[PDB]
């Protein structure tokens, strides 16, 4: 037991074929006895012999035993301290190039244990080039092994942009995604999805992950019984989804997201809405699919259930906004919001306690709902016009006398845009006129921002079809600024300005 020890060292530190080798197959034996190991690591000359012969050997039984020895040692916070003080990490790492399974296995786990409990280990693995070696090991097939490898990477990448970028350069994205769409073993899916989550916040990793088919691979696991796996997939998907606009094969993912809106889980709902919102920005096929599986229905139920939780309603309202314009079934989707009792909650969201990003999104949504003639009347009846006008008036004031991520100039355009559309209905024009908005619309012709000139001239154009309003618009002195705008680089502005002008001088 306790006494006869550094005999076995000398032999390992020897420079001969069988001599050091068969001497290895002994400390291995001795390391296996938990109280005999708890004493073996005390001699740094003994510790270091193990390391050396490991880095420089040729024997499959030799390596196995030296690794295993270190494996077995890495269980005591004294073993760890010893392996560290000795310099195991560069050798262990160097061992990640070996072709003998059981050696890889011992190396990875030892590094894993060091990475978990040993002060200073993360730095030394990076310095040894361990990230690159670990990425290259991702093509293996034993799941316990990949679990441990991906966890090493997670531990190294977390909070370390340098490590994230090296992972990128070694082809991590592709290799981690292949894992997500190949295996079923929860523990490994979960840790891989955590590496991907850590990489998904990096501006360079994100497109690389999206190009490897990340969105679809993460999509595959959204119905797993494991809640931690689903949630991690949801967060990664969300971080990535602004970069995923050009991706195809999105049908299954899109369908599951809609279902997930039904969920009792708040973070589930919040992510599915935020993902659907992003994946539906600009890409009209995505609009099509989400409408096809009942997305309008689901998004409305979600807005109704969220009440005043803006982490939910804001992205759900943004999604609804995307789904209600510029695609083959926009029109059906504009109707459907009304048919599922959406109109009263949408107008409500214009009122406190709603914060600006929500209000902007909601005004945008109302703009689009108004393109549908059968929404004219209920939007009016629900109170949309007076609030829109108040939001317009207040925001124009804030513009003149000089917020929370949104510029009042966008509220001005959004509200004037919505009123432009609402103004196609004759009763709406009466309400808009009664609110004495004409002076404000005329002032908005002088805006520096073209998009504001456009909606202002557009809405005046709608008002000017009624004789009384045409008279009013003239009495505001609209002729002069409309006259300069006939020459706008923006053809939207020029065209409306001539329609208003034409309706005024019919006298
Ligand atoms: O969804 C939520 O929880 C946000 C945060 C405060 C207001 N509503
Ligand atoms: O966000 C706010 O504080 C106010 C409430 C209504 C208009 N904007």
Curated annotation (Swiss-Prot):
Mutagenesis or variant effect for residue 503 to A: Abolishes CTNNBIP1 binding
Keywords: Acetylation, Activator, Cell adhesion, Cell junction, Cell membrane, Cell projection, Chromosomal rearrangement, Cytoplasm, Cytoskeleton, Disease variant, Glycoprotein, Host-virus interaction, Intellectual disability, Membrane, Neurogenesis, Nucleus, Phosphoprotein, Repeat, S-nitrosylation, Synapse, Transcription, Transcription regulation, Ubl conjugation, Wnt signaling pathway
GO molecular function: alpha-catenin binding; cadherin binding; chromatin binding; disordered domain specific binding; DNA-binding transcription factor binding; enzyme binding; histone methyltransferase binding; I-SMAD binding
Subcellular location field: Cytoplasm; Nucleus; Cytoplasm, Cytoskeleton; Cell junction, Adherens junction
Principal subcellular localization: cytoplasm
Region (Interaction with BCL9): 8-30
Gene Ontology cellular component annotations, sorted alphabetically: adherens junction; apical part of cell; apicolateral plasma membrane; basolateral plasma membrane; beta-catenin destruction complex; beta-catenin-ICAT complex; beta-catenin-TCF complex; beta-catenin-TCF7L2 complex
Tissue expression profile of the protein: Expressed in several hair follicle cell types: basal and peripheral matrix cells, and cells of the outer and inner root sheaths. Expressed in colon. Present in cortical neurons (at protein level). Expressed in breast cancer tissues (at protein level).
Residues that bear S-nitrosocysteine: 461
Consequence recorded when altering residue 360 to A: Abolishes TCF7L2 and LEF1 binding
The keyword Transferase is assigned to this record: no
Effect of residue 164 to E: Abolishes TCF7L2 binding
Post-translational modification: Phosphorylated by NEK2. EGF stimulates tyrosine phosphorylation. Phosphorylation on Ser-43 and Ser-98 by CDK5. Phosphorylation by CDK2 regulates insulin internalization. Ubiquitinated by the SCF(BTRC) E3 ligase complex when phosphorylated by GSK3B, leading to its degradation. Ubiquitinated by a E3 ubiquitin ligase complex containing UBE2D1, SIAH1, CACYBP/SIP, SKP1, APC and TBL1X, leading to its subsequent proteasomal degradation. Ubiquitinated and degraded following interaction with SOX9. Ubiquitinated via 'Lys-11'- and 'Lys-29'-linked ubiquitin chains by UBR5, leading to its stabilization.
Outcome of swapping residue 502 to A: Abolishes CTNNBIP1 binding
Modified residues (Phosphotyrosine): 183, 185
Sites bearing Phosphoserine, chain numbering: 43, 98
Impact upon substituting residue 278 to A: Abolishes TCF7L2 and LEF1 binding
Outcome, altering residue 287 to E: Abolishes TCF7L2 binding
Its biological purpose: Key downstream component of the canonical Wnt signaling pathway. In the absence of Wnt, forms a complex with AXIN1, AXIN2, APC, CSNK1A1 and GSK3B that promotes phosphorylation on N-terminal Ser and Thr residues and ubiquitination of CTNNB1 via BTRC and its subsequent degradation by the proteasome. In the presence of Wnt ligand, CTNNB1 is not ubiquitinated and accumulates in the nucleus, where it acts as a coactivator for transcription factors of the TCF/LEF family, leading to activate Wnt responsive genes. Also acts as a coactivator for other transcription factors, such as NR5A2.
Protein name: Catenin beta-1
Organism: Homo sapiens (Human)
Lineage of the organism: Eukaryota, Metazoa, Chordata, Craniata, Vertebrata
């Amino acid at each position: 037991a306790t006494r006869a020890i550094p005999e076995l060292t000398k032999l390992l530190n020897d420079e001969d074929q069988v001599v050091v080798n068969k001497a290895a197959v002994m400390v291995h034996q001795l390391s296996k006895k938990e109280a005999s190991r708890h004493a073996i690591m005390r001699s740094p000359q003994m510790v270091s012999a193990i390391v050396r012969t490991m880095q420089n050997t040729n024997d499959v039984e030799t390596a196995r035993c030296t690794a295993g020895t270190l494996h077995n040692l890495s269980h005591h916070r004294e073993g760890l301290l010893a392996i560290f003080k000795s310099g195991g990490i560069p050798a262990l790492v160097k061992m990640l190039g070996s072709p003998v399974d059981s050696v890889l296995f011992y190396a990875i786990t030892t590094l894993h244990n060091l990475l978990l409990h040993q002060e200073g280990a993360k730095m030394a693995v990076r310095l040894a080039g361990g990230l690159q070696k670990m990425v290259a090991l991702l093509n293996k097939t034993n799941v316990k092994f990949l679990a441990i490898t991906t966890d090493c990477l997670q531990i190294l990448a977390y909070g370390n942009q340098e490590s994230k970028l090296i992972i990128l350069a070694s082809g991590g994205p592709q290799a981690l995604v292949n894992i997500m769409r190949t295996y079923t073993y929860e523990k490994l899916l979960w840790t891989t999805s955590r590496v991907l989550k850590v990489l998904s916040v990096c501006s360079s990793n994100k497109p690389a992950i999206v190009e490897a088919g990340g969105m679809q691979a993460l999509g595959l696991h959204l119905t797993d019984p494991s809640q931690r796996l689903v949630q991690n997939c949801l967060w990664t998907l969300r971080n990535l989804s602004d970069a995923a606009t050009k991706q195809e094969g999105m049908e299954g993912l899109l369908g599951t997201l809609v279902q997930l809106l039904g969920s009792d889980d708040i973070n589930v709902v919040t992510c599915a809405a935020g993902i659907l919102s992003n994946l539906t920005c600009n890409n009209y096929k995505n609009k099509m699919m989400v409408c096809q599986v009942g997305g309008i229905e689901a998004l409305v139920r979600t807005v109704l259930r969220a009440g005043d939780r803006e982490d939910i309603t804001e992205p759900a309202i943004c999604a609804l906004r995307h789904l209600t314009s510029r695609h083959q079934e926009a029109e059906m989707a504009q109707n459907a919001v009304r048919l599922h009792y959406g109109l009263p909650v949408v107008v409500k969201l214009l009122h406190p306690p709603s914060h600006w990003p929500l209000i902007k999104a909601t005004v945008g949504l109302i703009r689009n709902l108004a393109l549908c003639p059968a929404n004219h009347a209920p939007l009016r009846e629900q109170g949309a016009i007076p609030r829109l006008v108040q939001l317009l008036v207040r925001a124009h004031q804030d513009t003149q006398r000089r917020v929370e991520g949104v510029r009042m100039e966008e509220i001005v355009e959004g509200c004037t845009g919505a009123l432009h559309i609402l103004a196609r209905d004759v009763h709406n024009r009466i309400v808009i006129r009664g609110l004495n908005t004409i002076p404000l619309f005329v002032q908005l012709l002088y805006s520096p921002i073209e998009n504001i000139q456009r909606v202002a001239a557009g809405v005046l154009c709608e008002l000017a079809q009624d004789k009384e309003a045409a008279e009013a618009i003239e009495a505001e002195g609209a002729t002069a600024p409309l006259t300069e705008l006939l020459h706008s680089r923006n053809e939207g502005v020029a065209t409306y300005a001539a329609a208003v002008l034409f309706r005024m001088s019919e006298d």
